[PDB]
Amino acid sequence: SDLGKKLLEAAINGQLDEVRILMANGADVNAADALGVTPLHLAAVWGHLEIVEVLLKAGADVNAQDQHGNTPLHLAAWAGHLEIVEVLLKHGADVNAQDKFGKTPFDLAIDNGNKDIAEVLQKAA
Amino acid sequence: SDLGKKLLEAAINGQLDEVRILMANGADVNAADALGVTPLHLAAVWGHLEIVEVLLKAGADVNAQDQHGNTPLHLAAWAGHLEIVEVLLKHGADVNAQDKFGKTPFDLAIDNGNKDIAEVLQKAA
Amino acid sequence: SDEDTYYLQVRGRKNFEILMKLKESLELMELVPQPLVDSYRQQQQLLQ
Amino acid sequence: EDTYYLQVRGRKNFEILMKLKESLELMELVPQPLVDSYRQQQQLLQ
Amino acid sequence: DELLYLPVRGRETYEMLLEIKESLELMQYLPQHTIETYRQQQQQQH
Amino acid sequence: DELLYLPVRGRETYEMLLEIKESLELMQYLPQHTIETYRQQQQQQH
Fold this sequence. Notes:
The complex is a heterohexamer, with two copies of chain A, two copies of chain C and two copies of chain E.
Chain A: H1 3-12, H2 16-24, H3 39-45, H4 49-57, H5 72-79, H6 82-90, H7 105-111, H8 115-123
Helix pairs in contact in A: 1-2, 1-3, 3-4, 3-5, 4-6, 5-6, 5-7, 7-8
Chain C: E1 5-11, H1 13-28, H2 34-44
Chain E: E1 3-9, H1 11-25, H2 32-43
């Protein structure tokens, strides 16, 4: 039973209790699928604040990059999850991290009309 | 883009003229596709008597086998082409040739209600 | 198993043209001589 | 991007086209950044 | 008509792509007539 | 659920299988609820 895949599936599906029990049985919070996508990425994009927090607390890399150079901050910004953006900045998310098309989290926020989030990222400079 | 390929295409499509011209430009009548299927197989299953005859005259293997051990006789019998069956027997088609499931041309004839053809194959023993 | 006809709908033009191209090959499958189907399948499992 | 209708002979054909209709339509709900990440890996595996 | 190698994650998808691949690859064994007959049956269907 | 390599004869076929493979492979990135929502929306049109 490989706990990497199980933890990624749980992050996507917002299964807080499932995530907690997988970590306690030794799951790697920095487990990445074929595309370099981590549980922190997936919890961030699907708007699972509590799960984002347990993973960060458990030492989840805050500026982990997938194939595309998407960080959790990129995906939260993309997805319009302000509360999650705020936490990532707190845990030291690179505001200036660039995806492979040179988009910053700020740019992704703008492109999808997340003005509140863009204002936060501009001032978090 | 292959002479082999072009001749298989012509056999399927009953293009007698085309088959004659491809052979005269040095097409191989024993050309087989990925599955070991030959022009004689394809002319036989699609009921192209005249094309069957030009290929046999031009030295086509009468008991050529595909991946499955299908001979031209198998496919003629399957397809209900009595005139073509008769010619293949004349040119020495193995009545007892077995596909990989141990089915004979006789068996395939019966299973599809080609009684006239089955009667011929039973007696051609 | 019934030879009955089913309807389905699909959002977006490009999705339609993909499903049609497949509807075609899938429906035309029925007209391919069984012996050549079996010859194909026995070589698919030979490449497993 | 309106709605198009199509018909199909035979149950097994229908259940295949439905399974595909599903993934194709559900495509629109997959975050672009993960799509971009997938495509950038497809290039390098071809 | 080379033998190309398509990368696939998981059986569900492999098995599903295999089924489809089969219908596509097996149409080389149909007369041009038979296919045209069918597309005329479909354009006369729209 | 490892990366399997599917043999394909023909580019037209490979290219066609590639399009489809994308939609199927990318559904791994959707929550269970999102798919159920969609199938419930499809049960409605039986």
